[PDB]
């Protein structure tokens, strides 16, 4: 059994590794196929245990990864793509 305080601590609003679809970050790139199609990003997650609050990023960074891009039936390449990350999170109105 997981103890109450241990739950509360691990669940409270903070940056957590979150798997995100690349198309969600780059919606105009629908013509392409990406490998991988999703990437691990530090994003604000968890609860504020309030109803007047919400977990939101107070500090952001950008991270660069090597992704394979395929335009079906005209070549593929592995290049660098940038993704927004959350460094600090807070419960806010």
């Amino acid at each position: 059994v997981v103890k109450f305080m241990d739950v509360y601590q691990r669940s409270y609003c903070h940056p957590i590794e979150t798997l995100v679809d690349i198309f969600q970050e780059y919606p105009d790139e629908i013509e392409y196929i990406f490998k991988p199609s999703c990437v691990p990003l530090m994003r604000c997650g968890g609860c504020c245990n309030d109803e007047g609050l919400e977990c939101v990023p107070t500090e952001e960074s950008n991270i660069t990864m090597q992704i394979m891009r395929i335009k079906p039936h005209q070549g593929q390449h592995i290049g660098e793509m940038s993704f927004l990350q959350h460094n600090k999170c807070e419960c806010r109105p």
Partner: protein
């Protein structure tokens, strides 16, 4: 430690606290388990001073 979690549960059981107070106490406790008993008293004081 079972004792630290027992104190956490006690503070959380006080009904008259609001969302903000609740969290302050629990998070302070989580950050510093040594202050567990003192944080319990202060919340007790607060809980009854906030009696409806």
């Amino acid at each position: 430690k079972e004792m630290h979690n027992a104190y956490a549960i006690e503070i959380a059981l006080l009904p008259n606290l609001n969302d903000q107070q609740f969290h302050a106490f629990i998070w302070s406790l989580i950050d510093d388990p040594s202050q567990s008993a003192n944080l319990l008293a202060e919340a007790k004081k607060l809980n009854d001073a906030q009696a409806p």
